[PDB]
C-alpha cells in the first residue's frame, strides 16, 4: 500500500515483556506508534499480534530491495 512503510525483521526476537512481540528473521511489520524510540508498536503481517518490538531489529523493506529505473 502506497504510503505505508512496510519493515522486515532482521533478527530474531523473544518477548521480554507481556506487551513485547515475538518474532523471527523477515517478518513483516507495519509500524503503528513510534514514540518509545527504542520501542516500536508494530502489528506483524504474519500472525497479527500487536505489540512492541526493539526499533533496531527492524528495516524499511525498501532499503534492501534493489532497484531500477525502467518500469
Known sequence: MI???????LYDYEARTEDDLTFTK???FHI???T????????S???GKTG???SNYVAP????E???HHH
Open 3 to 9: 504510503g505505508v512503510t512496510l519493515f522486515i525483521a
Open 26 to 28: 523477515g517478518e513483516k
Open 32 to 34: 503503528l506508534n513510534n
Open 36 to 43: 518509545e524510540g527504542d520501542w516500536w508498536e508494530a502489528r
Open 45 to 47: 503481517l504474519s500472525s
Open 52 to 54: 512492541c518490538i526493539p
Open 61 to 64: 523493506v525498501d532499503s534492501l
Open 66 to 68: 534493489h532497484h531500477h
